[PDB]
Amino acid sequence: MLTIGQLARIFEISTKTLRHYDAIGLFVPARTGSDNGYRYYQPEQIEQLSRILALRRLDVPLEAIDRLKRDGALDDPQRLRHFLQRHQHTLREEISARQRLLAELDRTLATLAHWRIRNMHARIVERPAFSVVGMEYFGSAPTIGQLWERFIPREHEIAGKHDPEVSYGICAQQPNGEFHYVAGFEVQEGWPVPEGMVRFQVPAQKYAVFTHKGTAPQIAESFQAIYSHLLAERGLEPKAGVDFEYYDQRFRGPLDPNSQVDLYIPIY
Template sequence: MNYFESMERTIEYIESHLCEDITLDELAAMAHLSKFHFHRVFQAMVGDSIMEYIRLRRLTLAGQQLRQTRKRVVDIAFDYQFSSHETFCRAFKKTFGVTPTECRRDKVGLSIRGKAILRRDDSRLGGFTLEPKIIFKDTFTVVGMEIITTQEDNNTNFTIPKLWSRFNPRANEIENRHTGGLGLCVSEGFENCDFSYMACCEVSAVDSIPEGMIARTIPACKYLVFTHKGSVDNLGETYDFIYGKYIPNANYEIQSKVDFELYDERFKPDSPDSEMDIYIPIK
C-alpha cells in the first residue's frame, strides 16, 4: 500500500470539496484504512488532525473571500459548511484573533493554513528513528475496564489517564492475570473517531470477572512491535514517527484490528530509563 499516494489523493479530494460536506467515512474509505488508523496516519503525516485540517482550510479560504469579495459574511459561512453566522464568527475569531468584519474592514493579514504538502523525509520528525520487531501473537484474552473515547477527548479531558487511575488500584482483583498491563484500542464498529480503550491485564483463564470490568478475546495477528524509551510525555513523538514516517515508507499494510501498548517490568512512567512496547496489527 502506498500511503503517500493515498494521503495525497485524500488531500486533493478535501481541497476540491471544501464547500461541501466531507465525512470521515468517505475519506478513510478513499485511503483504504479504518477510520481510527486513517486519523492517526493523517495527523502524523500532515501535523493536524483530519477535522482540524479541514476546518483551518475552510477558514483560510473564507478569509480570502472576505478580503477579495463583497459577499455577505453569512453567505461565506454557509459556503464553507458552518452551521450558522455565529458559529463561523466564533471559529474565525478563535483562529485568527479578529472577527470576519474586522478582517474585511481592516484588510487584516491572516496566519493561513496552506494546502498540506507531504514530504517523504519529514523534517518535523528530525533524526528520530526506531526499528520494530515483527511478531505473531496467538489469540489471547484480557480482563479490565473499558471506555469509549476519541483522541481529541483524551487530549482535552484525559479520559485514558483517568481510566488507569480507576483501574490500577483494582488490578489485583483479576484472577489468573499475567504480570504487567495492556492499553488496548479497538476501533472497528465505532462511528467517527470513536474507539474502545481498555486498561487491562492478559489472563490465562477467565474464572470470574470483577464488578465493573469486562473480558475480551483478541484474535491471533501479526504485529509490528515498536519499543518506546523514556517518559510517556514523549510518547506522541514515537507515534508520529510510526504513523508519519516508518509505516508510510515501509511495505506493511495496517489491519483494522486491535492495537495495544504493553507495560511490563521495564515500564517506569516518568523515568528516562522506562520502556514500553507498541503493537500495530499488520497483514
C-alpha cells in the first residue's frame, strides 16, 4: 500500500489535493490509518488517480469530474471516451472560430494601410547640400535593412557627427541604371572617415517630404504609393536625384509599428 505522500510524489501533486478528493468522495483512500488517522491507498488506484489528474490537465473542472464519478461515466472507458471526444470537438471549434477571426483581422489590417497612405500628406521643403559619412553600397540589390545591422555596430567610429540623433538612408541614382544606397550620419567636412566607410555629399534639392508612420519593411509600400499617384495628385513631379530616409527620434526600430520615417522625395 501507498501513503498519501508516496502517491502525491509519484504524481507530483500536493498532499491536500488528495484529502480534498477524499472530502468530495471523488477519490477515496482504501482505508484510514487506525492508529494515526492517515490515509492509505492501494496500487490499484494509481491508474484511477492518473485519469482524474489527466482530466484536470485538460482544464476540465473538478465538479465535472465529480459528476462523471457519480453517474459511473468516470469508471467506464466508453462513456469517458465519449466525454473526451465531445470536449475535443469543442476545442477544435473554438480554434476554428478564432482562426476565422484572424482572417477577418488580417483583412481589416490591409484596409488600414490604405487609410494610412491616404493620410500621408506631402510637405514641400528645400534643403542645402550636406555631407554624410557612413557605409555605402553600390549596386541594384534585392539587404538594406541588413546594411543597417551591418552598420549599427560601427556607428561609434564616426567622428565629428554634427547631429547624432538623426541618421540618413540615402539612395542615389546612377546614369548606370543601378542605384546607390548609403546609411550614415551628417558630419562636417574635414573629419576622418573610418575604415571601410565612405563620405557622400547630398546636393541641395527641392523635396516633397512624406511621413511614413509604420514599419521599415513597409517603407517600400509608401515609395510605391508616392510614385504611383501621390505626387501626381498634388501636381508634383519627381526629379532625378538623391532621395533619403530621415531617421530621428520618431524612429523606434525597423519592426516597431510606431516608428515614423520621413521620406525626402526630390521634385521639380
